[PDB]
């Protein structure tokens, strides 16, 4: 009933969804073919799966998500691998021609062909829906389908669905390592659209996941599979209070009204704790003080910018597993008495806490350990301004003498939208400065 | 000489060892929520989508909206 409809757009978003639905199937005990075992069944009136799955006629729990990619490669991999009988055969929506790292190609061209079919499928999923809580939209700022087509989906979902909160998980580009070359152009062009149509934009840095994996999980050669597994664990820890009962239950609207101060600062920072492996976890106590100090430890956030050069505004602590609010609020008190975590002066209390009893689950052979307690830090710091300034530096340095602009102009973009998006993100930076001071 | 396989048929995976592994201790408990009586009431209240016999009062101004012809 607390249904949480999902759209995974782009190759990156499709891989996030491929990890996420594996994790959700394991969490709710759903077999890959779609059915649920009878010895597993704790009664026919179970209702946790209704958030993410719908039971059609015979225990066939189909997932409530739409996979999008203009090139058919990753969705055909989904259709041929493991979770092939789970998804609806038409929900895995694809084109044939790809945008190929081009916001203008994803926005003003062939992306404008399948948008009607894909959000018609969104509309029919929402017609099947009855208690729609929000839209979980997974994409990347790297470029192409996840940059322009995602922005088109934001615009049409916004002025088709009313308030209808839209949480946007995005793979933000790293400071130094990167894959595409026009990726700063795609990021700058996508932010200008997502600013007025998103509600909680969770930026995820690939380099941040990489060094978190190699120092915490002790994985010497991590990869995109581990990246999407960790992101899946975090989004499950976010929307686990809707699926399981808790001592303090937080919903997708309490989260928003306790997170964002003003309706332009909606760019939080996610952080999971613990992200330690089994061998390190078996030798350590892992109490609530340690899982809070791991979250507030500044080499653990998921965008490469330390929060010490910034002021915390809101913190949505989502505790999961066997935790007690007494250890929680003792840890919150000692975090407040810690001087180096400087809260902002107009926010006396800034901790929204949600306790859930359900312990986190692990995939059969990943890198995270089956820990009895975990916590999702959700910062609203001003430290993301450093990442915004780095992308401004990259965009201005490549836009100094009009490099890689003829592609966008040929696809259909005018020459002015680059300047409009630069001015918009500069205004956003001015807003961050005037709210930080 | 075996050929290279897919992504799925690898150790380190998205869909390997998913059938033989089932999370027994974690989610066989009452921690998972049920569809009891007062969630069944909310799910059965969906059958009154805009068919309820509540009509607007004649002492209210928004009455000629629903009675335009008279």
């Amino acid at each position: 009933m607390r249904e949480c409809i999902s759209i995974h757009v782009g190759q990156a978003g499709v891989q996030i969804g491929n990890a996420c639905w594996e994790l959700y199937c394991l969490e709710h005990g759903i077999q890959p073919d779609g059915q649920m075992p009878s010895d597993k069944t704790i009664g026919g009136g179970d209702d946790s799966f209704n958030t993410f799955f719908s039971e059609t006629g015979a225990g066939k729990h189909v997932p409530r998500a739409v996979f999008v990619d203009l090139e058919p490669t990753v969705v055909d991999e989904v259709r041929t691998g493991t979770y092939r009988q789970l998804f609806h055969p038409e929900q895995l929506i694809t084109g044939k021609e790809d945008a190929a790292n081009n916001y203008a190609r994803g926005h003003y061209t062939i992306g404008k062909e399948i948008v009607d079919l894909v959000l018609d499928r969104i509309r029919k999923l929402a017609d099947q829906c009855t208690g729609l809580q929000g839209f979980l939209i997974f994409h990347s700022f790297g470029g192409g389908t996840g940059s322009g087509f995602a922005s088109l989906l934001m615009e049409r979902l916004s002025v088709d669905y009313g308030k209808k909160s839209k949480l946007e998980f995005a793979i933000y580009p790293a400071p130094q390592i990167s894959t595409a070359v026009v990726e700063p152009y795609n990021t700058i062009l996508t932010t200008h659209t997502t600013l007025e149509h998103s509600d909680c934009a969770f930026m995820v840095d690939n380099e941040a996941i990489y060094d978190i994996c190699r120092r915490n999980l002790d994985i010497e050669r991590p990869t995109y599979t581990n990246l999407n597994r960790l992101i899946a664990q975090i989004v499950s820890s976010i929307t686990a209070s809707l699926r399981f009962d808790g001592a303090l239950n937080v919903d997708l609207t309490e989260f928003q009204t306790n997170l964002v101060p003003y309706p332009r600062i909606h760019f939080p920072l996610a952080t999971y704790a613990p992200v330690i492996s089994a061998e390190k976890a078996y030798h350590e106590q892992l109490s609530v003080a340690e899982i809070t100090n791991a979250c507030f430890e500044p080499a653990n956030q998921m965008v490469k910018c330390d929060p010490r050069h910034g002021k915390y505004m809101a913190c949505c602590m989502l505790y999961r597993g066997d935790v007690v609010p007494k250890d929680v609020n003792a840890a919150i008190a000692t975090i407040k008495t810690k001087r180096t975590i400087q809260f902002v002066d107009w926010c006396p209390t800034g901790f929204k806490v949600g306790i859930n009893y359900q312990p986190p689950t692990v995939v059969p052979g990943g890198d995270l350990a089956k820990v009895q307690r975990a916590v999702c830090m959700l910062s609203n710091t001003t430290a993301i301004a450093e990442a915004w300034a780095r992308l401004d530096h990259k965009f201005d340095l490549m836009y100094a003498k009009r490099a890689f602009v003829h592609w966008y102009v040929g696809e259909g973009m005018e020459e002015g939208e680059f300047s409009e998006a630069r001015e918009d993100l500069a205004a956003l930076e001015k807003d961050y400065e005037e709210v930080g001071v | 000489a075996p050929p290279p396989r897919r992504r799925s048929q690898w150790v380190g995976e998205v869909g390997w060892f998913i059938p033989p592994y089932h999370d027994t201790k974690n989610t066989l408990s009452g921690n998972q929520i049920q569809l009891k009586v007062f969630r069944k009431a909310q799910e059965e209240k969906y059958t009154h989508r805009f068919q309820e016999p509540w009509y607007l009062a004649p002492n209210d101004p928004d009455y000629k909206q629903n009675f335009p012809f008279t």
Binding site: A278, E279, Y282, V362, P364, G365, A369, K370 | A1, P2, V11, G12, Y21, K25
Partner: peptide, 30 residues
């Protein structure tokens, strides 16, 4: 305690699987 021991056994079985695949690919190379 039983949960942690079962988890460690699962990790050991996975690591045995990667040892098996790497020795298989070594025999493939030879």
């Amino acid at each position: 305690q039983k949960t942690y021991q079962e988890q460690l056994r699962l990790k050991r079985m996975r690591r045995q699987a990667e040892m098996g695949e790497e020795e298989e690919f070594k025999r493939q190379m030879l």
